[PDB]
Amino acid sequence: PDPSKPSKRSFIEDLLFNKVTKF
Amino acid sequence: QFGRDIADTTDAVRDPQTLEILDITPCSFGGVSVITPGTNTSNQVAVL
Numbered sequence: 871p872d873p874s875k876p877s878k879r880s881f882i883e884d885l886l887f888n889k890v891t892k893f
Numbered sequence: 894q895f896g897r898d899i900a901d902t903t904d905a906v907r908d909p910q911t912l913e914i915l916d917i918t919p920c921s922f923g924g925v926s927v928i929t930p931g932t933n934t935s936n937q938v939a940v941l
């Protein structure tokens with residue numbers, strides 16, 4: 871985990887989250 | 894004169910007296926859930 875983030879995720883986890891994307 | 898959404902429902906309309914466009918947003922709704930301890934303990938509930 872990266873302590874500087876708003877959500878303590880690791881560098882690699884951030885990469886994963888940035889790749890996968892009524893009435 | 895009329896706009897439509899994916900469901901073919903009305904999205905917006907042009908007012909027939911004054912030619913301005915009005916958006917139509919369906920009135921607030923949602924599911925209602927009841928949070929409860931079993932009735933063998935209490936009849937008090939919370940509502941979500």
Ligand SMILES: *[C@@H]1O[C@H](CO)[C@@H](O)[C@H](O)[C@H]1NC(C)=O
Pocket residue numbers: 909910911
């Ligand atoms: C509705 O009435 C207004 C006057 O208040 C007029 O200017 C307007 O053209 C009328 N609209 C239609 C569609 O006849």
Ligand SMILES: *[C@@H]1O[C@H](CO)[C@@H](O)[C@H](O)[C@H]1NC(C)=O
Pocket residue numbers: 933934
């Ligand atoms: C549930 O209520 C009954 C009374 O109708 C009582 O006899 C039983 O012991 C209760 N069980 C629990 C787990 O509270």
